[model samples]
Target: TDLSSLIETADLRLLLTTVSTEVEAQQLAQAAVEAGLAACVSITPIQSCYRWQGAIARETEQQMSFKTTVEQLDALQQWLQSQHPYALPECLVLTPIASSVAYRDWLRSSLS
Candidate 1:
């Protein structure tokens, strides 16, 4: 409970990508972390409904969140797009307003 430091500015990024299967999500998540592009990757199963080129679609997917530093954002997005199965993969970047110092330090060490 004693360990706490507030980071006032955003220093990290949470990248989002949804894949067709949990297996692919796990594989990509593992590889991304191993490649030092992300500190951690969390996967969740979800039902997504959307429209593409006027075609409505819905399916079960795995939502993977890649937690990484802002510095790694560009590289991670490039690699993710290249490896992603979809012709147009979703690479959404979200920045947190703050984070604990301990967790931020961990992200730094985990990535380049």
Candidate 2:
């Protein structure tokens, strides 16, 4: 299969969660891009409100969005989990319905 095939075959998404730290966020983003696990990653700071052990809790967290192909998803998830600071870091996947053709092509080409 060619690059276009890779792009059309899957909609890959990975949600990476981390503590509120600029250094950690930058490192994770850089590592993913450099290793080709993700063609690109966007980091956003968000306020997380959830329940832990039956108590309500709120904390600042960094959400990372990774753009990758289906084949790379499992390896990327494993790598992120291994490097993540949280015991159970939030790793969620969403299937994208639509994406820019040019951008998708670029992403498929960029990955090794």
Candidate 3:
């Protein structure tokens, strides 16, 4: 079988968000997963540089990548916003061109 046949190239989404604190990242990840809003979430420490309110800001933040299906993207994004500590939380969506079939199946079954 062709390698392309073993993977799916659509209907998957990778949601990205950042929290100012590690504990917040943990809480969001835990809640999202338990609620079946996301199949898996990975958290990492990162340094962010951006302009906020006409000022240059540099800070350490926790970046979170949520693995979920496109079917759940809207719900997950809304829920994250409602529960997030930041008034304007970042909820960016990315679509993977390809993901392994086994992983896609597992991710789908893990969500509602």
Candidate 4:
């Protein structure tokens, strides 16, 4: 088995957005890692503007980037949606184009 074999399994970069709060961000991050759904998660705060319920909205949000394989995405998404504060959370998956060899090994080792 090699990187190409793993590539067929889809190494996904999942993005989840939440409110700008330390407690919420921490909880989400910890839960995902502790539950073995993600190898790592990076949370960053940002200002966002969007439309919600027929109104323009502006708010501060935390964007969480999850690094994991496709096998874990379904469980990860279920956990996030079930625990997220917002009714509709953003969950987007992007295929990884390139990654360092060392980091890829670390990622694969971190998850079950």
Candidate 5:
């Protein structure tokens, strides 16, 4: 009945990552879904501001949201880490995640 229900199902996982280039985002989004690590990956251009090495940093980035099943999260994160260009890339899990029944069904099938 709520987003927290997604966690109870133990089959849903969501993540957000930022890439510096559109090509990087495009490539990963395609590869992840094709590899069954994610059911859907949405990429959007965004402006990011952060502190790196104790200095203010700002850049244009492509943010990617991956929708997958918990079973696939570990592999997916490892794959991303191995291939990610950033020395310390962001792969933040979205907590209390939620999804449509049908979408979760697709995710389960996609990863199996």
Candidate 6:
């Protein structure tokens, strides 16, 4: 993808996942930071419309952004999978390209 060329960093990983409820999102968000698996986790309300089993399904959900590093991503995913209330886990992985050095250091340190 053209976008791939724009990203360049080491161990900078970001993941996007969703939960059916804000409560679930809040639970993971808190745990991620507390466990040192993520430097930051953000939760926001969202409306998702999709089809399941040949029927249209509409739902209210929370979008959670989990920020971690390549060094810790596998462990973080395992931890989340163990705790998540889902039949299947969906994670949209991303790599960050730009940020202040101080900010990056702080985020990196927070997880360390």
Decreasing lDDT order of the candidates? 3, 1, 6, 5, 4, 2
**Each prediction's number of clashing residue pairs:** 0, 0, 0, 0, 0, 0
Evaluated at residue 46, the lDDT of candidate 3 is: 98
lDDT of 2 at 90: 80
| Per-candidate alpha-carbon RMSD to the true structure | 1.6, 4.0, 2.2, 3.7, 3.6, 5.4
lDDT of 1 by residue, 74-108 (tens): 99999998889888887788998887777777788
**What TM-score, computed on C-alpha atoms, does each candidate reach?**
0.91, 0.83, 0.91, 0.83, 0.84, 0.88
lDDT of 1: 0.88
Q: C-alpha displacement of 81 in model 3, angstroms?
A: 1.2
Superior candidate under TM-score, 3 versus 6:
3
Candidate 2 to truth, TM: 0.83
Q: On residues 7-100, what C-alpha lDDT tens digit does candidate 4 reach at each position?
A: 3334655656565676798898998899988999888888889898999999888888888877788888888888888888877877786666
Error of 4 at 48 (Å): 1.0
Against the reference, the lDDT scores of all candidates come to: 0.88, 0.77, 0.90, 0.78, 0.83, 0.83
Residue 40, candidate 6: C-alpha displacement in angstroms: 0.5
lDDT of 3: 0.90
lDDT of 6 at 80: 81
- Model 4's lDDT to the true fold? 0.78
Residue 107 displacement in candidate 3 (angstroms): 0.4
The alpha-carbon lDDT assigned to residue 57 of candidate 5 equals: 97
Comparing 1 and 3 on lDDT, the stronger one: 3
Score residue 73 of candidate 5 by CA lDDT: 90
